[PDB]
From a paper:
structures of the Mep2 transceptors from S. cerevisiae and C. albicans. function as ammonium receptors/sensors in fungal development. a central channel for the transport of ammonium. non-phosphorylated, with channels that are closed on the cytoplasmic side.
different crystal forms to high resolution (up to 1.5 Å). sequence extends for two residues beyond Ser453. differences in the rest of the CTR.
Author numbering:
A (entry chain A), B (entry chain A), C (entry chain A): 4 to 453
Amino acid sequence: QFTGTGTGGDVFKVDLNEQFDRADMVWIGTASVLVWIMIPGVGLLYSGISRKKHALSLMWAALMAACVAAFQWFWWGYSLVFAHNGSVFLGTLQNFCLKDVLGAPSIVKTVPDILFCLYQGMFAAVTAILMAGAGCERARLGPMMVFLFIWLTVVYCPIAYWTWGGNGWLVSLGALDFAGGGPVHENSGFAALAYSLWLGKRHDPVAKGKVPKYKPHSVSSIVMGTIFLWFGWYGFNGGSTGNSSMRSWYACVNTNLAAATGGLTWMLVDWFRTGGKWSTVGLCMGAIAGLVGITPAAGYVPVYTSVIFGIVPAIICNFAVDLKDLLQIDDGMDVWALHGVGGFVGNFMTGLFAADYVAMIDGTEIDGGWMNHHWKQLGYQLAGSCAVAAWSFTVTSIILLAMDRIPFLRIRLHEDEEMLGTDLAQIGEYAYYADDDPETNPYVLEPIRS
Amino acid sequence: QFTGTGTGGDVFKVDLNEQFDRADMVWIGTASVLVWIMIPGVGLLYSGISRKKHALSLMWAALMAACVAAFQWFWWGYSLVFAHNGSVFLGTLQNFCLKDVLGAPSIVKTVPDILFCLYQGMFAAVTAILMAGAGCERARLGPMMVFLFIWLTVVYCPIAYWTWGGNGWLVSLGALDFAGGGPVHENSGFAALAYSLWLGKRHDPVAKGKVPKYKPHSVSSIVMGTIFLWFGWYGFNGGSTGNSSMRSWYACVNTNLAAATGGLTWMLVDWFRTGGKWSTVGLCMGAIAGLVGITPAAGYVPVYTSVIFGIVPAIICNFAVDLKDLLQIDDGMDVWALHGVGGFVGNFMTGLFAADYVAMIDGTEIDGGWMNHHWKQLGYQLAGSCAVAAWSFTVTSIILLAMDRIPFLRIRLHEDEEMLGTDLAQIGEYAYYADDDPETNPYVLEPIRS
Amino acid sequence: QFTGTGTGGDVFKVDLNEQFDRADMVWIGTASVLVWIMIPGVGLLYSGISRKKHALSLMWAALMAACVAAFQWFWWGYSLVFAHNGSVFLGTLQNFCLKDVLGAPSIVKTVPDILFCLYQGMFAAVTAILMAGAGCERARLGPMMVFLFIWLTVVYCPIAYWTWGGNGWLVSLGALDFAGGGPVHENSGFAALAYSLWLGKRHDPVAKGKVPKYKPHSVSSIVMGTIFLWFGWYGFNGGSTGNSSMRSWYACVNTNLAAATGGLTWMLVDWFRTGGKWSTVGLCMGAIAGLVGITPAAGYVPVYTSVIFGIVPAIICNFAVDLKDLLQIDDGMDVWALHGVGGFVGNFMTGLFAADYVAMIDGTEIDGGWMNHHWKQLGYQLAGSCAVAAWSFTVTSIILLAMDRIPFLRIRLHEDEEMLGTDLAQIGEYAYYADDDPETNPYVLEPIRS
């Protein structure tokens, strides 16, 4: 018999696959593979956009993040989000090292635990490289890897549990978050802001007003990142139905249209604000703003409203990027502006435009948003957004400051203890610091103490 | 009940998904995602092959084209091709802003309208970047975006309707075009030729005989473009069955073999013509020539004949590229040679090698080509090819010349009104023109009037 | 009726697709497309890692290999592995030019011949670029293409037959090889070693001890290669079930975890051995070592053991790379170390950790390994590994030395007959040798005789 718990049954006695539609499984398997390539997509995007020379290559750091996140997820991340037996705030260690993760129907009943594990693990990894990218400036790699492991454990996993978990309190409340805009984008964005405000370079010369808003390290990297992100986002959003229904393809149409209108909107805004220039970076940032914006909404809103999920996040995020000038901080702030602000805005607008008849395309039951005169929905969205932002900002701050107090865990060295790469390159043991060309340097040019 | 029209039925009363095989839908969903990455594939290919420094980066322009095409398709492109109620030449605005596009079976009855919309929208976008690439030299971006919107509307959509539309006159005639070689490749190719002959630089120093046939801007971009194109072409051709049958995988085998033999053929032709050199660009152009060649044929011809769809387009396109020397025009001509000539040749040969027993692999009924002694088939193919070439060349010419007469819509400035980037870089307001390195320049170095 | 042989039946009388689960077919179709992009993944990886300037760009050579392998596979490669009527060592020419390859159930009964042909053809192509990459230094292209065709025919196809063929003697013996670690990785690795020992540069200045272990040509190429390889490996391993069951997704979870732990392990080993440096190349090589390691095991071992398939191959391969210093040979040795040694180690450990209850997830019956007290399994694995290594090393040696004796087939010129690119660039007919920048050079800078 099928037990519905643990491994789901004895494989020598039952065929666990009989519980699931095979095409549902194939689409979520494919969607998993698509989300995986978003991981280097993030790295390429933020490597390319940077107005500063990062010692750590974020294209490469994306592979590091893929490794650390996969291990964390296996170790206990999956279990802390999707153990079928948690509180309303967190799971348990019931599935430590993926013990008994096999063929029981997952919280998404149309796929087995092992496949939901594969799929959702990719979301954790995308969030990991968002966070690594946000905090990469003058990062020490050892501490960064420890930080990512800890951060996934006590920031990502709780927020993911609230959003996706069987007893997650946001689920119970009635908040909507179609493809995990909260755990991935809003979360990483406000964690990025914690990094900016505590560890980021202040009075940063690249952020002092009379300097260009856009000054990319590599436009080709921006474009390649945006390509991988848009391509992969079809799995990110399209797979968030958990099935092969046409709500999946509907979500993909919304995804494409939000990206498209976001890109054009941001570029048009830049055109107006610059007095007629065509912004290469702006088009890409706008596509990302729309992809982020539509993430909580893609399987819930009517197709024609998806254009609003491009336009409004593009406009608001474009102006949010200007805050870097007020603060005179660059580090971490792009991730905050696109993912934190974009995620907040998209989540809010999901309360306005969610429609029960869109969810019903595959039989999913929701009360809907303002499209259905369900006025309360907007309050549920705000509650989710504020909770995510509060937890992510506060707990990320605590982790960063706690690690800072520990010499061998300090992620970013204090400027009074930091050795100059110019001077390191003169010391014999550190002569390899003379090659700050990450295209040929075999070693990360890690900050060194005195 | 299932209505077969409009949304296809009331989602609160019926499950629209019951009409479709879930695995059919998953493959066409996946194929959609694969065709999307062909869009930057085109941009990379034509950016890399260029013998001239384009101010507009085509890798980046591919994302711009993805945005413009997605919006056009949503706005009315989809409706003009696939409204279930058009003439024999064009659709209607019944599905303006994708109104009522949901779960009715599409013209391809094995998938719902919303999924066919997703899939076919990708073909429009691939064609958009082919056209943007063809017309990119000294292009002004604002006018280019307007041009693409207009061109998709009155050149792409009619030709697509004739080919795929429920009452399309090419369909009724009996012409074969498996994966839309007409609307995508032959169309963009002869539109490219219109660009070359009216707007392209004449007496072009890079096309004056004593200069190299191959002189690529970036071989790595050529190769990356070819990679994305070949990878994505499995969705382009493999999804054109509309189903999960083994005719889909048969089409993929044909696709791979045509690419392979095209690449080797073009490189061998170059080897003979150069007296023993191995042409890096030639291998890539040959793979594209074979992919284009097999596009109208992939689900119709026996596997062993797919090698002819590599060899013959490779040879003919290789010599077509030489016409650039006779004309002394470079701009737009590569797109014409590969897609216009390749598409024409492939469409012609489909009349020779189409077999009813190949179509019958998934129950598709055709009379076949010369393989079945259906001699008339070749005439149907020629009719389609000539109609596509005539409409695309003529109407593209009219659009380009009409926009040229309008100062704020002129796509390419006349040489007497065009400001020198060298001189712009001296004027204070235009000092950013001094950085013509598109890897770090945040702005398109758009042509400026006097 | 369904015949089970030849084309599988008359398409005008029966629907051949009725024999197969459509979702099984869609996943293997998708997996085919994913394995295809591993081909340029290999090229990028070995182009980037190189401590030497290769005249042949391996990114480009990957497309050449895709062409040659697809043609060989069509011509007779498929038939020599999967003709339903061979010996215990090789197939026949029954499916020459894919004659009668259509809808009969393949050796993997859940998919038709034409789809298994598509899928398995990709494995041949991945192996082809591994071999081209291994033997690329100072290679002449014409001879290289002939070599690849011959090598696929008499080295790859026999080993593939033993592993996958209906009567393959390794299958009969009881050896386990889930995703073809033998035919692809161990095979190419020991073929690479044959290249190193017979044709590779000896007393190579880059391999003389006092020089860096890691000195990459292009870290961005390494990372992009690793991205394409890890992404594609989900199809490589995940599709090796032949079905849409959750054993496919289980294999993907193992694949991701082995890559992740391999990357971290190799980087940590480098950290210890260098006294605290963070190795950019090492992380990537470790992910590949884990992907190779888990390949024979992914659908057979419990998830928690997949971490061992990252850790142990990473450690052993890391030290295997040191052999380059002892031998003072660089050419071919990276492919041997990762794929030859990694493949050998993974195959061995599959005998330890294979579990009948993992195979049983989709009803697959195996005796298992030491996890099931099936002690004999380790001996079966060793037999397979030694047979593959012996055949590949010996026959590759014979091919290389035989071609060397034939002036127009010699793959690498002898140093006494080899012309200097510096001196070629002075001879008028060879002036194009002055541009050794493969990013703009339209021609392969092939070695020229005196």
